[PDB]
Structure 1
Amino acid sequence: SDAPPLTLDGIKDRVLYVLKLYDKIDPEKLSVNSHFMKDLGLDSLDQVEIIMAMEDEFGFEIPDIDAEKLMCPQEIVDYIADKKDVYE
């Protein structure tokens, strides 16, 4: 009934959706393996804002240590899947 389950493709699509709605990231250079500081050219405050946006989307907070470990959209997707037990 209520609360449809999460999928890996859905998590990836929503993460890329938020990152495309971010103004500092041009959507044409965004990839799932795009690093925030290497090939996106962002900084630590931008990364904190990105993690807060992901928390606002998925309705639960990431603890600070794992949050500062997360540095790419694939890493964010893997963390969300590991936390929410999305196996496929």
Structure 2
Amino acid sequence: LEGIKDRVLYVLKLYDKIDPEKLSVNSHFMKDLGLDSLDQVEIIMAMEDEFGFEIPDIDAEKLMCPQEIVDYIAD
């Protein structure tokens, strides 16, 4: 989708306890970036407010990378 990767990366970089340049595109938030069990999916919850669509609890477990999150965001 056009104009989806640019919007999601801007919101994730602004959030606290995250690297500004080290982790970007196709990198795991829990495995590569370094986040806690509750802190990893917490960034995905904040990203839902910026896009304007509610995310279910079942689909949230599968998402970890911004490249994977961009595909799930499109409906």
Q: TM-score, normalised by structure 2?
A: 0.85
Structure 2 unaligned spans of 5+: none
Rg (Cα) greater in structure: 1
**1:44 shift after superposition:** 2.5
Identity, in percent, stands at 97
Q: In the alignment, does 2:39 pair up with 1:46?
A: yes
| Shift in alpha-carbon separation, 1:31–1:9, aligned structure 2, 3 A | farther
* In structure 1, C-alpha distance between the alignment counterparts of 2:60 and 2:69, rounded to whole Å: 9
Q: Please, what is the CA RMSD of the aligned residues?
A: 1.9
* In structure 2, C-alpha distance between the alignment counterparts of 1:50 and 1:18, rounded to whole Å: 9
Q: Deviations for 1:27-53, whole angstroms, at most 9, x for unmatched residues?
A: 111211111112100123222321211
> Secondary structure of the residue that 1:16 maps to in structure 2?
helix
* In structure 1, C-alpha distance between the alignment counterparts of 2:16 and 2:27, rounded to whole Å: 15
Give yes or no for contact 2:29–2:35 (8 Å, CA) kept in 1: yes
Q: Which has more helix, going by share of residues? A: 1
> Secondary structure of the residue that 1:10 maps to in structure 2?
coil
| Shift in alpha-carbon separation, 1:9–1:32, aligned structure 2, 3 A | farther
Give yes or no for contact 1:20–1:30 (8 Å, CA) kept in 2: no
| Shift in alpha-carbon separation, 1:60–1:19, aligned structure 2, 3 A | same
**1:9 shift after superposition:** 4.2
* In structure 2, C-alpha distance between the alignment counterparts of 1:11 and 1:44, rounded to whole Å: 26
> Which of structure 1's runs of 4+ aligned residues deviate more than 2 A?
none
Give yes or no for contact 1:34–1:73 (8 Å, CA) kept in 2: yes
